[PDB]
Amino acid sequence: KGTFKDYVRDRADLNKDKPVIPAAALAGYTGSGPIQLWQFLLELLTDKSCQSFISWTGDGWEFKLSDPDEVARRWGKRKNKPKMNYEKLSRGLRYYYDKNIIHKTAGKRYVYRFVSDLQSLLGYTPEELHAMLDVKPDAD
Incomplete structure (x- = not known):
């Protein structure tokens, strides 16, 4: 893939550059405007510390x-x-x-x-995506 996958892989410093798929990072990549929920959620998910409440x-x-x-x-x-x-x-x-x-x-x-x-x-x-996020599926 040559999508946001390796886009972040070379960069990871777009806009909401915190997680694997940073919120505004993909928002700016695809041009969803002022962030897009699933891309914002992706931030929190593809971020291991922020993955907490999601x-x-x-x-x-x-x-x-x-x-x-x-x-x-x-x-x-x-x-x-x-x-x-x-x-x-x-x-x-x-x-x-x-x-x-x-x-x-x-x-x-x-x-x-x-x-x-x-x-x-x-x-x-x-699989790989969540795997790199050290996902903890148990909420609280």
């Missing part, structure tokens, strides 16, 4: 927010909505639901699954 479950594209209202705030804060609650997040998640990027997998503790398969946009293979 960890992958291990294999395949699936992740889980540990303080999902907080994680909402995270997303909102970057869009001038610091009081972002899960619903406001879920509204955004619904925008990505339509693009088939995010399916809010209910029943689980705020687990969303990347129904777009980011292997095509990122190049990072799901």
